[PDB]
Design a protein around this ligand. Sequence first.
Ligand SMILES: O=P(O)(O)O[C@H]1[C@H](OP(=O)(O)O)[C@@H](OP(=O)(O)O)[C@H](OP(=O)(O)O)[C@@H](OP(=O)(O)O)[C@H]1OP(=O)(O)O
Length: 178
Amino acid sequence: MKFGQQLRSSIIREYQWHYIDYDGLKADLKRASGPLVASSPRREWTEDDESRFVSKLEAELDKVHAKQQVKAMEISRRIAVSEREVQDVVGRLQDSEEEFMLLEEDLSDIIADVHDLAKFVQVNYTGFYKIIKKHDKMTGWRLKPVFDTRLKAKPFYKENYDASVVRLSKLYDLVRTR
Ligand SMILES: O=P(O)(O)O[C@H]1[C@H](OP(=O)(O)O)[C@@H](OP(=O)(O)O)[C@H](OP(=O)(O)O)[C@@H](OP(=O)(O)O)[C@H]1OP(=O)(O)O
């Protein structure tokens, strides 16, 4: 594989300082402080090395989850203000081609922002998934049993955000047709 270069190439300036420190966590796995193990020598992985890695991994997990929250909530706010704008536009034109034009460009920008956030969620989820399996393969100590459900854990906004994205798709189809 070539994730180290893949993640670096797929960096958006909007999320630039909030991506996984994949190279940083990979370097931490090589920094073992236990007894020297012979192989036809490299130091062994300890409880202290494990505690250091988990703390560094959790700090990276919070950094990603914080950026995922701020952007999704801003998108949910952007959907809410645009939904009202479409509602009074469809309402007034029931009781102008330019009005649909401005709304079509505004709603499509949110769809692109949803995809760019989905790309960030994708590249980061793969990042943690790959580094956790790398830890289990290099050290021998398994981190996957509790970290698989920690990454699959759904935040508070996720249920309301997914419904907003569903409405956004319906709002865009309504302005494009009329
Ligand atoms: O191809 P790169 O992006 O330059 O990075 C590779 C690649 O790492 P990632 O795919 O996880 O980013 C190898 O991983 P695999 O091909 O095994 O999936 C990994 O190999 P090992 O895990 O077996 O070590 C190797 O590591 P390294 O050379 O540090 O031992 C590492 O290379 P670099 O870290 O030197 O870029």
